[PDB]
Amino acid sequence: RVLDVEVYSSRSKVYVAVDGTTVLEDEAREQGRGIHVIVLNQATGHVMAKRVFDTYSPHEDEAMVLFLNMVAPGRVLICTVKDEGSFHLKDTAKALLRSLGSQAGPALGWRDTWAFVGRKGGPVFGEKHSKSPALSSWGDPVLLKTDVPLSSA
Numbered sequence: 001r002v003l004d005v006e007v008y009s010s011r012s013k014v015y016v017a018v019d020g021t022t023v024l025e026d027e028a029r030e031q032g033r034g035i036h037v038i039v040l041n042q043a044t045g046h047v048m049a050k051r052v053f054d055t056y057s058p059h060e061d062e063a064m065v066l067f068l069n070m071v072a073p074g075r076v077l078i079c080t081v082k083d084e085g086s087f088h089l090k091d092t093a094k095a096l097l098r099s100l101g102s103q104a105g106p107a108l109g110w111r112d113t114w115a116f117v118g119r120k121g122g123p124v125f126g127e128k129h130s131k132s133p134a135l136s137s138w139g140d141p142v143l144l145k146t147d148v149p150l151s152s153a
């Protein structure tokens with residue numbers, strides 16, 4: 001009646017595991033920058049969608065808003081940052097993250113790391129964030145482990 005979800009965010013690597021199996025893994029050098037988004041079915045944990053939005057670059061946040069607005073309220077939403085996700089994470093995207101109940105997403109800054117798991121229509125199940133300590137540095141890696149309640153019937 002739960003999913004065991006692990007979410008890792010860091011300078012050089014992201015992964016998401018569901019029930020002990022990796023559903024997203026990106027350790028490649030200069031690829032996959034930005035906010036990775038995974039959508040799960042809330043009864044089975046099956047992956048319904050996997051995206052990456054390079055929100056270090058313009059226009060990617062607008063794509064993220066359009067995509068997230070089409071996700072159904074009951075889905076499990078998972079976000080994780082690789083490298084840098086904030087430079088072009090602008091106010092409409094930050095407001096949308098706030099509407100999910102995210103505390104760190106709306107405040108995401110330069111080279112911060114961030115892991116998030118929540119039901120789209122609420123509540124948030126888990127969240128971790130590490131602030132970069134200097135412009136030339138990254139947040140520390142964060143590994144979030146959350147038991148997500150499953151729906152049924």
Ligand SMILES: CC(=O)N[C@H]1[C@H](Oc2ccc([N+](=O)[O-])cc2)O[C@H](CO)[C@@H](O)[C@@H]1O
Pocket residue numbers: 033056083084111
């Ligand atoms: C050449 C280089 O280091 N580029 C990196 C880039 O490095 C920067 C170095 C200096 C500045 N600056 O504005 O002074 C910006 C990015 O940072 C990006 C976000 O972390 C990285 O994705 C990118 O690989």
